[PDB]
Structures are given as structure tokens and as C-alpha cells.
Symmetry: C3
Subunit: 237 residues, 3 copies
Amino acid sequence: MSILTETVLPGIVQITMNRPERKNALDRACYQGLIDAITAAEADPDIRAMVLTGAGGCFTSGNDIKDGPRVAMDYLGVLSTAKKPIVAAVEGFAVGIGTTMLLHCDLAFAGKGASFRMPFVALGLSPEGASSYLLPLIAGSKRAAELLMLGEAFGPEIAHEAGLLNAVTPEGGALALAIEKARALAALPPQSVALTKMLLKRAQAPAVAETIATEGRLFGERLLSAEAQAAFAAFLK
Amino acid sequence: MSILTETVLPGIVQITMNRPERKNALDRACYQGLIDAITAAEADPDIRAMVLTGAGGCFTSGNDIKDGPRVAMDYLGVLSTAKKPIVAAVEGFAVGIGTTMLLHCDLAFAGKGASFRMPFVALGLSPEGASSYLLPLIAGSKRAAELLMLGEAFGPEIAHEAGLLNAVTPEGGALALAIEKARALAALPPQSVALTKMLLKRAQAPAVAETIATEGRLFGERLLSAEAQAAFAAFLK
Amino acid sequence: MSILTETVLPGIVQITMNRPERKNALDRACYQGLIDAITAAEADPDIRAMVLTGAGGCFTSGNDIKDGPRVAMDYLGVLSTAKKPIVAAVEGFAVGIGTTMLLHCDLAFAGKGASFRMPFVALGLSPEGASSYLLPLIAGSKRAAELLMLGEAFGPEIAHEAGLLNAVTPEGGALALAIEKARALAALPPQSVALTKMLLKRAQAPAVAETIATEGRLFGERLLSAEAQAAFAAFLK
């Protein structure tokens, strides 16, 4: 119950990652909570768009180290196959699955001061979220290599240039823009919106599902490597 | 006979959408006219490049509501498989198939003040022109969603950033640049130009042809939906 | 022995195209030399990254006209399947295979004043390096057509915008940045780096190998055309 859900406007549900003490870090129940909200909103004929965001000037710092990867994979599988529009609004940290889940949102906006990173390689792990398939397609392979292979931190402007964001707002302004765009989505003919999203994703969809499964298997392998063991011990200083 | 054709320079045919009273709106005969010009230029060993443009500070406002989609599909099928270079030059409105036909031109230039839009979703319709396949590839999925799913109007700079335009000229200057580039194409060894274009398009070509057919079937379905009926009635105020 | 190899830092080999009198033009032995360096570095467990560059303010002017294409193809086949990171650093001319080999490097940087070109079409030839497949994917089809079909010369900023370069440095500064990024690659867990690179390239890899073979066959055909014969005679004034 660290995942907030409210109908904030007609046709629009807002799903909020709410754990600011731990930078909205995703607990196992958070993944379940996120699966429940999306599922309910998909089944709800009231609802024509979803906005996804985090509380307290933070999006999410990613997977909670304390609170294997199968539930993360279930969430990505749910997120990537949702039939209705999903609009993301990012402030502060969007790290790990914080970044890669943006790949499956139809629209994404971040304020200045946002900080993105995929540090899987540095933890002796491997890509997730179908990032190893999608990111070369939307960012070009050069940029996909600097972000996934080097695991460089990056700001919203690079995130725009890399195909992760439609637009950068000033700081604290991403949610207002996200809600505006969700409103315009909700005012459109919903069947036509759904058909368009499905056709937009038609060519990538089987490769995304097979990539999530293949990444998950390797990620599970990598969680058992000596490199991951040493890197986590290094990450705890 | 609202489609003008002239050999304007050695090796170069200019095909002009000429209906300024209706913003070069495409009539059923216009599609046929456009099919005839491309076909003749393809068969003509005189001809090494085509420039495509509209008269009167306008490219086209798209499909003429008065004057089903099979002939549009035949034109796209013809445009997408032409063996010789096609260079587009856009002023003013390039709306609907006005925009999506740019996907199949090898080069495209627009002046400042150009206005692009794919408003299919707003009319309770669905994507066409193989836009649902190509646009995610050239623009990234984020930007493809704002343009097709929201149907936002957009200018030439966004059209450049979205992979629809090689370059933006000042207003009224797109045709001069288009002709310059067609001249350089015509001065090159034509068999080598043709082989290069074919290899550039080799990976996308079957998916484009199957997407045009699949979009056309859904578009035909959607022309019969209640949503399209209501949206057109709304569009007529 | 115009290909220099040195371990310049721990874990890092630098491979230098060294023929400044002929703008580092690639001789048949240069291709062999480049195959040997990559192969040795791949087999060497000391080595975690490769930097590739040219001497004398030049990257390479490409295939040496004097000193058929099968050895070029063997090099590309080797370059495109290397398991360890490869970082390119470009000054001056990067022409022909000078440009297309950048497609297979994981990272690439050039200084201001760099000059890129794929002039295959102008020589009555055809694309190589799997450029006809990769370049539309990373640059969009519009830009791939201006570069391959027109064979326009272009600078590093366009090379960045076209997905050939991670970043542009000032003149003479590309090697320093390349070495910095290779150092960061070498400091990361190598198995995790290798797994990530392999997953990044997993979807493109069979199409790259089949495209290299198909381009090579057509390139060989084109080396025998009258157009190539006339264009080379024209190129010699």
C-alpha cells in the first residue's frame, strides 16, 4: 500500500510511487501494487488514460535492495502489454527499472534536475526491461552502449535525445504536463486511441516479450555470479 | 488533371499537386493522376529523379472528404515501391496522407511555416501510410505516440527531429533545395543510385507492404465505426 | 606493419592506422593487420577494451585504390563480431570504410574538423559495411538516403546527429576522450560488460552478417560495371 491510486480527472487515473523516505524504492508489494493498479484501470471502462509518477520530487530509485526478479518481470510484462495510454511524469531519481519502465509508457515527461541511470553493468548484472532490444532502436546503438554498457548517469535532455522523453519541463512541472496530455488522450475516441497504440507496438511486441524473458533468465544467472557478489559488496563500501 | 507533370531539368520530373482553392486536397482522380506520373517517370529512361510538391504555398491538406481507401492504398503501394529517387518539397499544409506520404520519399524538405498533422485518431480512424510501422522506427516510439496517438499538429523543426525531413529551409525555399538535391541525384550513376536505394529499403520493404494492407483493412473497418461517424459530424460542427 | 598495437593502459589496447603519407589509406596488409590486432586482443585475457584511431590528424581515407573486396569483408566480419568493447577516435578524414567501420564500434568520438563521407554511389559502386541495413536504423531513412544515396561529405555534428558518434570533442581531442571512456569500460566487471554488449547486438546480429555478405556480392558485381569503370576514370580526371 505504498502505491497510490486516484481518479484525479474524468477518465484519468494517477498511480503514484509513494515511499519518499527510500526515494520511492520498489518493494516486492510495490510491484504487486503497480500490477493491481494497471490491471484495475485496464478493466475499468471509466478509465481512458493512466498517469504514472512518484512522490516527493522523486520518481523511483529502482528495485529495493532489501525488500527473485520474477515479480519485476511480471510488472514489466503487465506494463508492456497494457492496452490504454500510460503517461509518465518524472522528478528527481529515475534509476534502474526507474528508467527502463519509461520504455513501455506511451508518453514520458521529466523536469529539469531529473537524474536517470541504468547501473546494472556496474553491479555485475545485465540489462532488463527489454532495454537491450528497445534502447538501440530508439536511441541508436552508440547511445545505447554509453547508457547500458557504461551505465552513465544522465539528465532529462539526454533522456529526450535518447528517445526516453517526449519533453523536458522545468523542475516540478512534469506532472502538470503529463496530466494535460492525458486529458487530451482521454478526450479522444478511445477505441481509435487503443487501435493506434496497438498498431504502433505491433512490430515490436513479440520481440519485447521474448527479450523480457531472455533478459530475466540472464539477470537471474548474473545475480549468482561472483562479479555481482563482489560489486554489491563494493557498493556497500 | 489537377496533377501537373513537367520535365523541369534534364533527368528530373516535377509532379505538382495543383488545387489551391481546396489546399491541394486529393480527389480520387488526383490519386490516379499521381499513380500515372510516378509510373510514367519510372518507365521513362530519360528520367533519373522526381520532385513532388504542391502549388500555392501548400503541399496537401490530404484526402478530399467529398471527392473506399483502396485507391489511396494503391498510390502508397506505388509510391513505396518506386525504384527511382523521389524528393519532396513542402510548403504550408501537409496533413493526413500529406504527412505520411513523406515516409516513402527518399528526401524531403519543408519551409518555415509548414504545418504537419496526422489527425486520424481525432476522426475516430486509424493510422495509414505504413506510419504505424515506420514512424516508431524513424522517430522513436515516444514521438510516434504524440504524433499518431494524440494527433498533434507540428512544424518543420519537429518534422526534422522526427525523421520526416532532411532539412528546413526558409519559407518558400523548399522547392529550390529539393530541385538542387534532385539535380545532384540525377548527375550520379543511375544504376548505382537505384541499387543503393533498393538496399536501403531492403529490410523494411515486406513489412511496409504488409502494414499498408493491414492498416487499410482496419481503416476500412474504422470508417464504419460509430466513433468515426460521430467525430466527422463533430468535425462539421 | 602499418597497424600499430600497444597496451597503453591496464586492460586497454590501442590500434593505430599509421600511414600519414597516404592519409592512413588501408592496404590489403592493413586489413590483415587490423584482423590480427582485434583477434589477439579478443583472445588476450589481459585486455578489456580496444581503442581504434589513426595517426597524424587523420582517421582513414578508406580503401587504398592501388594496394577483391573479400578481405575488407573479413575485417568487417571480424569487427562486427568482436566480444569486447571497441572505442573509436576520429580526427580528419574518415572516408568510405573509414565511416562504415564506425557502425561496428561500440563508442565513437571525433574532433571538430573531422570529415566523413561514403562516396560509393559517386564511384558507381554500392553500400558496404552493413551500412545499407544499419544506417537507416540509427539515422532514420531520410538521413541514410542523403549520406548513402547522394554520398554527401559531412562533419562530426551531423555524424553525431546520424548516430555515428557519441560526442564531438574539439580538434585533436577525440583520442583523449576515447581513452577516458575505455578506462571506465575497463574498470567495470568484464563478463557483465560482454554480456550487455552481446544482448545490445542480439537482434541486429544475423541481419548484419547476411547484409555484409549480400553487400559484398553486389559490390563485387559493381566493381565490374561500366559505370564504376567510367566513374573511376572520371575520378582520376
